Design an enzyme around this catalytic site. Structure first.
Site, PDB file in Angstrom:
ATOM      1  N   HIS A 194       0.796  -1.220   0.000  1.00 21.52           N
ATOM      2  CA  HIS A 194       0.000   0.000   0.000  1.00 21.52           C
ATOM      3  C   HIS A 194       0.837   1.282   0.000  1.00 21.52           C
ATOM      4  O   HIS A 194       0.870   1.975  -1.013  1.00 21.52           O
ATOM      5  CB  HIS A 194      -0.954  -0.013   1.200  1.00 21.52           C
ATOM      6  CG  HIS A 194      -2.056   1.000   1.122  1.00 21.52           C
ATOM      7  ND1 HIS A 194      -2.996   1.144   2.121  1.00 21.52           N
ATOM      8  CD2 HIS A 194      -2.368   1.917   0.177  1.00 21.52           C
ATOM      9  CE1 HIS A 194      -3.838   2.108   1.795  1.00 21.52           C
ATOM     10  NE2 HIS A 194      -3.481   2.595   0.620  1.00 21.52           N
ATOM     11  N   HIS A 196       1.156   5.022  -2.952  1.00 16.35           N
ATOM     12  CA  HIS A 196       1.397   6.391  -2.484  1.00 16.35           C
ATOM     13  C   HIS A 196       2.795   6.960  -2.758  1.00 16.35           C
ATOM     14  O   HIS A 196       2.940   7.981  -3.429  1.00 16.35           O
ATOM     15  CB  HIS A 196       1.114   6.460  -0.969  1.00 16.35           C
ATOM     16  CG  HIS A 196      -0.335   6.311  -0.610  1.00 16.35           C
ATOM     17  ND1 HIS A 196      -1.163   7.390  -0.382  1.00 16.35           N
ATOM     18  CD2 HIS A 196      -1.110   5.208  -0.469  1.00 16.35           C
ATOM     19  CE1 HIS A 196      -2.387   6.959  -0.113  1.00 16.35           C
ATOM     20  NE2 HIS A 196      -2.380   5.640  -0.161  1.00 16.35           N
ATOM     21  N   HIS A 248      -4.047   0.315  -6.598  1.00 18.41           N
ATOM     22  CA  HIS A 248      -4.332   0.963  -5.331  1.00 18.41           C
ATOM     23  C   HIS A 248      -5.733   0.591  -4.826  1.00 18.41           C
ATOM     24  O   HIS A 248      -5.892   0.354  -3.626  1.00 18.41           O
ATOM     25  CB  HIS A 248      -4.195   2.487  -5.446  1.00 18.41           C
ATOM     26  CG  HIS A 248      -4.617   3.214  -4.200  1.00 18.41           C
ATOM     27  ND1 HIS A 248      -5.854   3.806  -4.066  1.00 18.41           N
ATOM     28  CD2 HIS A 248      -3.990   3.382  -3.007  1.00 18.41           C
ATOM     29  CE1 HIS A 248      -5.975   4.307  -2.846  1.00 18.41           C
ATOM     30  NE2 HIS A 248      -4.858   4.063  -2.179  1.00 18.41           N
ATOM     31  N   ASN A 287      -6.448  -1.084  -1.203  1.00 18.95           N
ATOM     32  CA  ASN A 287      -6.969  -0.089  -0.256  1.00 18.95           C
ATOM     33  C   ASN A 287      -8.405  -0.290   0.251  1.00 18.95           C
ATOM     34  O   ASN A 287      -8.636  -0.273   1.464  1.00 18.95           O
ATOM     35  CB  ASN A 287      -6.883   1.314  -0.879  1.00 18.95           C
ATOM     36  CG  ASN A 287      -7.334   2.414   0.078  1.00 18.95           C
ATOM     37  OD1 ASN A 287      -6.574   2.847   0.918  1.00 18.95           O
ATOM     38  ND2 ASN A 287      -8.580   2.850  -0.045  1.00 18.95           N
ATOM     39  N   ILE A 300      -6.959   8.440  -1.316  1.00 15.78           N
ATOM     40  CA  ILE A 300      -7.191   8.250   0.107  1.00 15.78           C
ATOM     41  C   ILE A 300      -6.249   7.142   0.591  1.00 15.78           C
ATOM     42  O   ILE A 300      -5.995   7.095   1.815  1.00 15.78           O
ATOM     43  CB  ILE A 300      -8.690   7.894   0.379  1.00 15.78           C
ATOM     44  CG1 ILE A 300      -8.980   7.931   1.886  1.00 15.78           C
ATOM     45  CG2 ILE A 300      -9.034   6.521  -0.199  1.00 15.78           C
ATOM     46  CD1 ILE A 300      -8.565   9.216   2.566  1.00 15.78           C
TER      47      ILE A 300
END
Ligand SMILES: [Fe+2]
Length: 818
Positions: A478, A483, A669, A673, A818
């Site tokens: 993650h 990110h 993602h 997520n 997010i």
């Protein structure tokens, strides 16, 4: 002589105040230039009135009429300047010139004119590679890029729109305490790491290599997305949780107003049933906060109730089955780590001189492979593993020296049954061993068991594996892979590809909110004493562990087919539609993923040819070449010395690079997520930490496994206080804001004037709808129930392209939002 125009804007929160001499615009010509080759500029024109004609105008937007003095001799307008003379900034949506129509999509904050070094400029929605830019706009195009790059110095301010790089030297807080000092990540062979957005606050007083603290972590202004509904500002939740809610929770525990530990599994289930009772002032501190107040139902006095996690909606005990433990490795929150195993016993590449003999202690004859011999299982490609041995071993000694933290470096062996489901057949719990170790704890192998103390030891073994998995998922699958890996590409794109560039238009939708959520993460999620350090196993060693993993990150291995082949879960096969043959036929993440991957590939393959006719056109694109060179040499600079970076001198390479970027930001993602609270909302199913090793026979701890197995389990995993905090953060992260923009969607129907590009995008969207219908059929196919639903009866919907707002367990956003 006069050109009728319409300006749409959003006030920072009446209308008439925007009139008079408050706001002026100046059209710029794209066909007629001055004696300096620059497009001619018109007169300062002010808003003249409030337009209230067309219904299609919402989002607290307001339309304003304006007429420009523009003779046919001035050419065709292709851009415009704008100055805000008011004290307060406003959000500019668009400009439309009628009579054909010329559209400008702006979506940008315009602050008071005195705060800007150069006047804000906006271009019409036409798309141009560098060599196709109208001559009168060439200099304006380059000047704007230079403005976006800045000069690499100075403290960035709220209204700045400057994109640049810096290392992760802003996580520690040495001025507050030497205990909060942290290693700089990035810029060294010891700690390589992707770069992040530069903020420039300056050095701390005790350490010149660490950036000082700040109340607000800057991001270029338009990266900080506003929201019409306060509940949709999900990214602000982590700050409130760490700074306001966490201390309130701690007080309730310090005053002994609630039991300090969970004493039975029912105490955990109570959280989403009747709720947890807390002191009045604790409830009063939480209930009024935006975003936070949406996380729990309350009576307004003493109760907080969490939502029921998807994983327990049909069966609250199914998480404990061996079938669900293995199924989640191919359809759970972290479905991308399992690998094929082609030899036995499994091997290790770590130095035995440091950690002791690294030979596996798992014996082939002790395993139940449904009648298959080990050689038969190996040859038929039915043996797999979840291998965290080499990854965790280097950190076990330092983690285990911490108070209340004890882990093993684990390895799990899995067998693919004839019915197509996976079953766990052994778990190895390893510890490092060196000369003068003070600890007498040793490594050990645990096998499946359904009764007696052996069943408790096997349940604890699964928990030690999932603590390794939860940590690797959060920090690597993650944080690092989505990110952190993506930010360098966002920065490079704004620094070197003009808003007019076709590749800028192709990629930017996939960056929405990424820099914003990352900056808020550096401040409250991955900082010294932040959320992750205080709730996950590695504590102060968490982020540096991700730097160690980054040493082996490979851009081209992020492509789905390459990932599947590298992990040994698929083989190359030209006779198949996707070019690969899966070794686990019903691997939900991979099978649904290949459909999404193929759809994105077709879209990129149809878009690129529209702007690049031959390989030479790619090699000769100056902006494109500067973009890629910087993304690699600066953005991911600590790995610039690697041989695998694509060259970008061919149409093939351009498609490849864009396809991988879009895949990482959207589907990859989403898959890692949005299942966080659905699977991890029950702490026993996804523990974030372990606090003790297995007990020795003859001790009271061992007697507890026999007499009170639920308590033995609960004493081993994450304690109640950090559980309340971690459940709250994953609930936020698993929620879709109502203003999200999903794959197959764009925030504006006029992002480009090119009808061919618009047509291709429409086909892409239609294909995604077609794919969803297919995935629904897969979930409804009874023959696939074992891997797609499992005993928890939870249909795998994480790769369905669409979703409504909320904690839905489905929907693929365009970006890491997010
Ligand atoms: Fe995320």
């Amino acid at each position: 002589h006069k050109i009728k125009g319409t300006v749409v804007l959003m006030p920072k929160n009446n209308l008439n105040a925007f009139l008079g001499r408050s706001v002026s615009l100046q059209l710029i010509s794209a066909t007629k230039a001055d004696a300096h080759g620059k497009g001619k500029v018109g007169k300062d024109t002010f808003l003249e009135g409030i337009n209230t004609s067309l219904p299609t105008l919402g989002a607290g937007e307001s339309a304003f009429n304006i007429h420009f003095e523009w003779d046919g001799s001035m050419g065709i307008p292709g851009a415009f300047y704008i100055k805000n003379y008011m004290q307060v900034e406003f959000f500019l949506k668009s400009l439309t010139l009628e009579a054909g129509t010329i559209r400008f999509v702006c979506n940008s904050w315009v602050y008071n004119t005195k705060l800007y070094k150069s006047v804000r400029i906006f271009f019409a929605n036409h798309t141009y590679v560098p060599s196709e830019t109208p001559a009168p706009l060439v200099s304006y195009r380059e000047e704007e890029l230079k403005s976006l790059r800045g000069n690499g110095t100075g403290e960035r301010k709220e209204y700045d729109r400057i994109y640049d790089y810096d290392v992760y030297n802003d996580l520690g807080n040495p001025d507050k305490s030497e205990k909060l000092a942290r290693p700089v990540l990035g810029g060294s062979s010891t700690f390589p790491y992707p770069r992040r957005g530069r903020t420039g606050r300056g050095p701390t007083v005790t350490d010149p290599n660490t950036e000082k603290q700040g109340e607000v972590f800057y991001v270029p202004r338009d990266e900080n997305l506003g929201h019409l509904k306060s509940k949709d500002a999900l990214e602000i939740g982590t700050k409130s949780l760490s700074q306001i809610v966490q201390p309130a929770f701690e007080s309730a525990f310090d005053l002994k107003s609630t039991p300090i530990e969970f004493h039975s599994f029912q105490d955990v289930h109570d959280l989403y049933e009747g709720g947890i009772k807390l002191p009045r002032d604790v409830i009063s501190t939480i209930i009024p906060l935006p975003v936070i107040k949406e996380l729990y139902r309350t009576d307004g006095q003493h109760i907080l109730k969490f939502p029921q996690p998807h994983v327990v909606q049909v069966s609250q005990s199914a998480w404990m089955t061996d079938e669900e433990f293995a199924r989640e490795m191919i359809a759970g929150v972290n479905p991308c780590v399992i690998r094929g195993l082609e030899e036995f016993p499994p091997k290790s590449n770590l130095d035995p001189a440091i950690y002791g003999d690294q030979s596996s202690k798992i014996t082939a004859d002790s395993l139940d492979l449904d009648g298959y011999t080990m050689d038969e299982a190996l040859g038929s490609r039915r043996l797999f593993m979840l291998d965290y041995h080499d990854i965790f071993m280097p950190y076990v000694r330092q983690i285990n020296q911490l108070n209340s933290a004890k882990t093993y470096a684990t390895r799990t062996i899995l067998f693919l049954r004839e019915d197509g489901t996976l079953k766990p057949v052994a778990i190895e719990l390893s510890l490092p061993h060196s000369a003068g170790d003070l600890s007498a704890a040793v490594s050990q192998v645990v096998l499946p068991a359904k009764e007696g103390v052996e069943s408790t030891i096997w349940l604890l073994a699964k928990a030690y594996v999932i603590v390794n998995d939860s940590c690797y998922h959060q920090l690597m699958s993650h944080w690092l892979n989505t990110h952190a890996a993506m930010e360098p590409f966002v920065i490079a794109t704004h620094r070197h590809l003009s808003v007019l560039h076709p590749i800028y238009k192709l990629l930017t939708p996939h960056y929405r909110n990424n820099m914003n959520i990352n900056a808020l993460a550096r401040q409250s999620l991955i900082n010294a004493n932040g959320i992750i350090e205080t709730t996950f196993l590695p504590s102060k060693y968490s982020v540096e562990m991700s730097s160690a993993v980054y040493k082996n990150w490979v851009f081209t291995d992020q492509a789905l087919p390459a990932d599947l082949i590298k992990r040994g879960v698929a083989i190359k096969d030209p006779s198949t539609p996707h070019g690969v043959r899966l070794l686990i036929e019903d691997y939900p993440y991979a099978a649904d993923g290949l459909e999404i991957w193929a759809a994105i590939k077709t879209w990129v393959q149809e878009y690129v040819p529209l702007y690049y006719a031959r390989d030479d056109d790619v090699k000769n694109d100056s902006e494109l070449q500067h973009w890629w060179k910087e993304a690699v040499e600066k953005g991911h600079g600590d790995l610039k010395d690697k041989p695998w970076w694509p060259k970008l001198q061919t149409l093939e390479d351009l498609v490849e690079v864009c396809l991988i970027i879009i895949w990482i930001a959207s589907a990859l993602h989403a898959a890692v997520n949005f299942g966080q609270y659905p699977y991890g909302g029950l702490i026993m199913n996804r523990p974030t930490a372990s606090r003790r090793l297995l007990p020795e026979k003859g001790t009271p701890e061992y007697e507890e496994m026999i007499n009170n197995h639920e308590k033995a389990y609960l004493r081993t995993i994450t304690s109640k206080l950090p559980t309340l905090i971690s459940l709250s953060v994953i609930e936020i992260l698993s929620t879709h804001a109502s203003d999200e923009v999903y794959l197959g969607q764009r925030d504006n129907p006029h992002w480009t004037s090119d009808s061919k590009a618009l047509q291709a995008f429409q086909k892409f969207g239609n294909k995604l709808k077609e794919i969803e219908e297919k995935l629904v059929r897969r979930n409804n196919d009874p023959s696939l129930q074992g891997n797609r639903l499992g005993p928890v009866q939870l249909p795998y919907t994480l790769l369905y392209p669409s979703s409504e707002e909320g904690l839905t367990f489905r929907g693929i956003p365009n970006s890491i939002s997010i």
